[PDB]
Each structure stands twice: as structure tokens, then as C-alpha cells.
């Protein structure tokens, strides 16, 4: 057949981690699969002269910009070669401004860009399901906002309305933006038991 | 036949996301289709020096301008090659001024410019059927402006003058440009109910 | 026959949007038609060193001038090649001064300039139909100037001192150039009232 | 016969707009006619280093002067080639001083200079 179809037709679902409601395949699994397909393949992390330092022959492994931070990884599997850009992000999938990033944040982004570069190959290309486009797939957390507003919306619809901050107090969530996925499910249980039964 | 007709005659409707009332197809789907048509195809993201840094050998992957931010993607499918420019935009499809963008905003724009570059080839040209030209909810904002200005005109016509800021004030909208669609509907009913009766 | 006659004899009326009372053909339609006529055709957006930045190797995709902003697009259909200039304008078709434009404004102008390059080709030649030559009724704003000068002169003809700035003060118009059309009609009402009685 | 006489003997009166009491033939009509006469012709808008900016490799498409603003268009119909100078003017046909022009004013001037350059060839000379 061909490399993309062979690689595309695989199940990488078992080796995935659900963090923040997104699906990620571990690099260890990607390194072995490609290694099997091609014993000798190259991974190159591009290095770009860091702006502020501006020292001659000084090349950091990541882009540094006032707007933020960028990484690049080029994976050459067999003859085929390809590259992926990615923004360095927090543990909550939020952007990091110039001077707020830590070397750990960069290495995690470098590893993630590797699997995405591998995803350019047939393996798991659509399995990512384009999580990058929908606010870093925080839509599951954004659904919580729709369901708390729906609980508030029933109140506005009925005789007495209730403020959202107090609805949040039901969940007792300090930051609706940072909440563990199990807690989103636990919060949904609270809201659905109140909101869903009234609707039904 | 030919590449454009073959690619043009496909249904990418199933793999689309409706965000902000606009339609986009995931890069994942675009990456696989082209890969099937051509096993070896190239995607290149152009790099241009950041203006403020002005460091030698420093090339960021996106344009930075006082006016705003631009990205470029060149997709070479088979022999054919082509390029697309795009403005980096907010999650509300609004422009980002110099110093207000985040790396995450740039990567999302880079991915979107890729599918638009693919759209140049037959695949997805119809899904993006000049979707930029339509209002894309700008009317959702202009309509409210036409209805508040219509009232200002009819009230002033009744011989008693009214001001746009006062019409904005009773809707208690901080920015007529940013208002939730339910709030536009909530704002619209009083104005449109009043306009017909006032004009009598 | 020939490319211009073939392309010229097409109806692009169905794929048009009426915004601001002007007719625009969507780029998506233009991209496909040319693609059919010629499978391999090139679209190039010219890049010009941005003035203020003045960074070496820094080339933005649009002209930036104190007077305003310019874009350029060169479409090579088959052997034939050609280029078009489009000014960046507001959503109200008004000019944008240096430092008031947003990247989104530039991309819209770039797309518009593309279809104008297609318009140079037989396709969409008549869609503009010379709608750019009319003054968009600001000539009526110039009529206000003729009617205030008629008042000034006929007042001076009576032997009574009259100055355009004081005649303007009657209308209390800060800028005779920017005045709402209802205000032009309201101002006309004032002038005729003064002007008619001298005739009696 | 010859290009000037053929082009000169045409009626472009129907495709004209009366603005400010002047007669103007739309560019769309000019682009088609020449295209028919010659399938491959060239229109070039000259670019001149803008004065105030004075950035290296910076070339705007129009002249900028304290006295005012100038545009240039060179139309090559068949073998014949020619160029036209147009002064940027307000919607009232008045001059625009340095720093009072808008990019829209320049593009309108550029389009008008095109038809005037076409007017050099026989087409619609009587209007211009």
C-alpha cells in the first residue's frame, strides 16, 4: 500500500492520556512505531537566535517573542520529511507571555510538537481531532459554563433568578477555567441533577 | 480528469465545526486527503524577522506590524504550489493590535491558513464559499445600530431629540460591538416594538 | 475564440453580495473559474519594506503611508499576467489613516484586490460597471457648497456682508465635508428659507 | 487603416458618468475594448521612492510632494506605448496638499489616469 494509509490505519487510543479533556498519545509509543517502520529516522528540533540575549553564536532551541513562545520540530520518517509549529502553553492550556515561561514548559511543548509532527504522517492524524482549533478543546469546560447558565436561565425564566457566582459556589470552584476533568463530571452531576430534572 | 475538479467534487461538510456562525474543516482531514492524493507534499510556514527585536539571524514565523499580525502558508500539492495570507484574529473574530497577541493566537491562525491554502486546490473551496465576504454576524451588530439610530431618528422626528449614547445607555451595553446574541435579541425587542408604534 | 471574450461572456450575477449598495463577486467563485480555465495559475501578493519599522529583511505584505494604505495583487492566468491596486477602506467604504488600520482590514482588501485582478481578466469585467467613478452622492454635499455660496453671493448682491464660514455657522457644521445626509437635507431647508425671501 | 483612426472612430458616449459637470468613461469599458483590439497588453503603474519615509527599498505607487500628489500610468497597446500624468483631486476637483490625501483618493486618481492613458490611443480622445 503506502506509508500514510498503513500508519493511518492503527489504533493509538489505548496509549492516550485525558488531561484537560483533550486526548494525547505518549511520545514513547510514537518513537517505537516509527522506529519499527524505519530503523533510521531523524528528529530535529530547530534552534533560533534568542532575541533579548542577542549574543553571537547563541542559539536557544525555541522562539522567544513579546507576543509569546514558539517551538518547531522536523521529523524525517523514511524519505518523507515534515515540520510542525506549536505555541508553548500552561498546564491549563493558556498562553505564556514573554518572561513567564519555564524551561519545563518548553520541553513539554517540544515533546508534544514531536507527536504532532508524527501525526502529520499517517499515524493518528485525525485522532487528535484538531483539538488546537476549539480554544485548546476547553469546550468541555465551556460546556460547564453553558450548564451553569442554563441552571441560572431556569431561575430567570421562573419567579426568582440566581447569580452565576453563587451557582459556581454550588460547585465551590475557585476558577471555572482550571478544574480537573473528573471535577467537571462531578460538577455536571450536581447541575444536571438540579437543572435536568426541572427541564424533564 | 484534473486535480481541481476531482478535489472540488468532495463533501467536507461532515468534518466541519460551527464556531461564531462560520464553517471550517479540521486540518487533520485536510492533511490526510492531500496525503492520499500525493504521498509526498510540502507545507511551509514563511518566517519574517520580528520588527522590534531586529536581531541578526532572528526570524519569527509570523509578520508583526503596528497595524496588526499576518501569517503565510505555502502548500505544494503534487507539482502545483500556492500561498495564502491571513490576519491573526481573536476568538470573537476581531483584530489583534501590536502587543496584544498570544503565541496560541498565532498557531491557530497558522493552522487555519493551512486549510485555506488547501482550499485553493479543489478540496474545500465550496465549504469556504467566499465565507469571508458575508456579514459573519457583523450585521448582528449593524442591525442593532440601525435599530437604535432608527429610534434616535424617529424620536428626533417627534421633535424631541435623543442621542446614540443614551440609546446605548438603556440597553446598558458597555460596548455595542461585544454583546451576546441573546442580549442582541433582548435589546432588539424593545427597540423594534417601540419603533413601529412611535412611527404610527 | 480568445480568453477575454470567453471569460467576459459569463454571468457572475448569482454569486454576488450587495453590501453598501455595491456588487462584489466572492473570491471562492473566482478561484474555481480560473482553476478550470487553467489548472496551474499563480496569485502573488506583493510585499514592500514597511516604512516606520525600517528593519532589514522586514517586508510586510501591504504599503504603509502617512496618506494611507495600499495593496497589490498580481494574477497570472495562463500566459497572460496583470496587477491591481486597492486602497484599504472601512466597512463603510471610507479611507483609513496611518495607524488606524487592523490586519483584518488588510486581508479583506487583499481578497478584494484579487477579484479585481480577475475583473481585469474577462471574468467579472462588468460587475463593477464603473460604480467607482460616481462620487457616491457627496456631490450633493458639494451642492450644499453651491447653495451656501449662492446665499453668500445673493446676500452680497443685496449689498449686505456675508462670509462662507458665518454662513456655515448658520448650519453650525464643524466640517462641511462630513455631514449626515439628513443634516444636508436639514441644512438645505435652512438655506432655501433664507434664499427664497430675497427672491420675493 | 490604423490603430488611432479605428479607435478614434468609436462612440464611448453611452458608457459615461456626468459628475461635477465633467464626462468620464468607465475603466471597465476601456479594459475590454483594448483587450479585444490586443489580447495581450500591459498596464504599469509607476512607483517612486516616497520622500518623508526615505526607507531603503520602500517604493509607494504615487509621487508625494509638499506641493501635492502625482500619479503615472503607462499603457502599452500592441507595439505602441505611452504614459499619462494625473494630479490627485478632491471629490470637488480641488487639489490635495501634502498630508491631506487618503489612499482612496490615490486609487481613484490611478484609475482615472488609466482611461486618460487609453485616451492617448484613439479610444475616447474627444472626451479627454
**What secondary structure does DSSP assign to A62-113, as a single string?**
SEE-SS-EEEEEEEEETTEEEEEEEE-B-TTS-B--TT---HHHHHHHHHHH
Neighbours of chain D (3+ CB pairs under 8 A): C
Record the cell numbers describing residue A120, joined without a space: 502529520
Q: Which secondary-structure segment (H or E) carries C140?
A: helix C138-157
Instruction: Count chain C–chain D contacts defined by CB atoms under 8 A.
Output: 118
A175 DSSP assignment: -
Q: Give the whole-angstrom CA distance, residue B55 versus residue A49.
A: 8
Q: Give the whole-angstrom CA distance, residue A72 versus residue A102.
A: 17
Q: Give the whole-angstrom CA distance, residue D86 versus residue B63.
A: 35
Residue B104 backbone phi and psi in degrees, to 5 = -60, -40
Q: How many CB atoms lie within 10 A of CB A53?
A: 11
- As a whole number of Å, the end-to-end CA separation of chain C is 67
D20 DSSP assignment: T
Q: Give the whole-angstrom CA distance, residue C26 versus residue C12.
A: 9
Our answer on whether A and D touch (3+ beta-carbon pairs < 8 Å) is: no
Q: Give residue A190's region: left, alpha or beta (phi > 0; psi -120 to 50).
A: alpha
* Long-range interactions of A12-19: CB distance < 8 A, separation 24+: A12/A123, A12/A124, A12/A127, A13/A127, A18/A181, A19/A181
DSSP strand pairing (A59-60 vs B16-19): unpaired
- As a whole number of Å, the end-to-end CA separation of chain B is 63
Q: Give the whole-angstrom CA distance, residue D77 versus residue D119.
A: 11
Record the cell numbers describing residue A190, joined without a space: 450536581
Residue D31 backbone phi and psi in degrees, to 5 = -65, -45
- As a whole number of Å, the end-to-end CA separation of chain A is 53
Residue C113 backbone phi and psi in degrees, to 5 = -60, -30
Contact B127, B12 (CB under 8 A): yes
A41 DSSP assignment: -
Contact B102, B141 (CB under 8 A): no
CB-CB under 8 Å, C66 with D99: yes
With CA atoms as reference, report the closest residue to D64 among D53, D55, D56: D53
At what angle are helices A181-191 and A139-157 packed, to 10 degrees?
20
Instruction: Provide the 3-class DSSP secondary structure of residue D28.
Output: helix
Record the cell numbers describing residue A64, joined without a space: 522567544
Residue with cell 478614434: D8
Instruction: Identify the bridge partners of residue D48 per DSSP, sorted by sequence position.
Output: D60
Of C54, C134, C141, the CB nearest to D19: C134
E-only strand ranges, chain C: 16-19, 22-25, 42-45, 48-49, 59-60, 63-64, 69-77, 80-87
* Long-range interactions of C81-84: CB distance < 8 A, separation 24+: C82/C117, C82/C120, C82/C121, C82/D43, C83/C46, C83/C117, C83/D43, C83/D45, C84/C113, C84/C116, C84/C117, C84/C119, C84/C120
- CA B109 to chain centroid, in Å, comes to 10
Contact C4, D39 (CB under 8 A): yes
Burial of A55 (0-12, 13-18, 19+ CB in 10 A): exposed
Q: Which secondary-structure segment (H or E) carries D112?
A: helix D103-120
Query: Which technique was used to obtain these atomic coordinates?
Result: cryo-EM
Query: In chain C, what residues touch B83 (CB-CB under 8 Å)?
Result: 43, 45
Which residues are within 8 A (CB) of A68 and not within 5 positions of it... i.e. 6 or more apart? A87, A88, A95, A96, A97, A98, B101, B102, B103, B104, B106
Residue with cell 435652512: C190
Neighbours of chain C (3+ CB pairs under 8 A): B, D
CB-CB under 8 Å, D107 with C85: yes
Record the cell numbers describing residue C148, joined without a space: 451656501
CB-CB under 8 Å, B60 with A65: yes
CB-CB under 8 Å, C111 with B96: no
Record the cell numbers describing residue A13, joined without a space: 487510543
- CA A48 to chain centroid, in Å, comes to 24
At what angle are helices B181-199 and B164-171 packed, to 10 degrees?
130
Contact D71, D63 (CB under 8 A): yes
Q: Give the whole-angstrom CA distance, residue D65 versus residue D83.
A: 20
Amino acid at each position: 500500500q503506502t506509508l500514510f494509509e498503513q500508519l493511518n490505519s492503527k489504533n493509538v487510543n489505548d496509549h492516550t492520556e485525558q488531561k484537560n479533556g483533550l486526548t494525547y498519545l505518549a511520545w514513547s509509543y510514537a518513537h517505537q512505531e516509527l522506529k519499527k517502520i524505519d530503523p533510521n529516522y531523524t528528529v530535529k528540533v530547530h534552534e533560533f537566535p534568542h532575541p533579548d540575549i542577542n549574543t553571537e553564536n547563541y542559539f536557544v532551541p525555541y522562539l522567544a517573542t513579546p507576543e509569546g513562545y514558539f517551538v518547531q520540530v522536523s521529523v524525517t520518517v523514511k524519505d518523507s520529511t515534515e515540520t510542525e509549529w506549536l505555541p508553548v502553553l500552561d498546564f491549563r492550556n493558556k498562553s505564556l507571555a514573554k518572561g513567564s515561561a519555564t524551561t519545563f514548559d518548553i520541553n513539554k511543548a517540544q515533546k508534544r510538537c514531536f507527536v504532532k509532527a508524527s501525526a502529520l504522517h499517517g499515524l493518528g492524524l485525525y485522532i487528535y481531532n484538531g483539538e488546537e482549533l476549539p480554544s485548546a478543546s476547553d469546550n468541555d469546560i465551556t460546556e460547564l459554563e453553558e450548564r451553569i447558565n442554563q441552571f441560572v436561565n431556569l431561575s430567570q425564566e421562573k419567579g426568582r433568578d440566581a447569580t452565576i457566582d453563587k451557582t459556581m459556589r454550588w460547585l465551590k470552584i475557585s476558577n471555572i477555567n482550571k478544574l480537573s476533568q473528573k471535577q467537571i463530571a462531578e460538577a455536571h452531576q450536581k447541575l444536571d441533577a438540579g437543572l435536568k430534572q426541572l427541564d424533564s
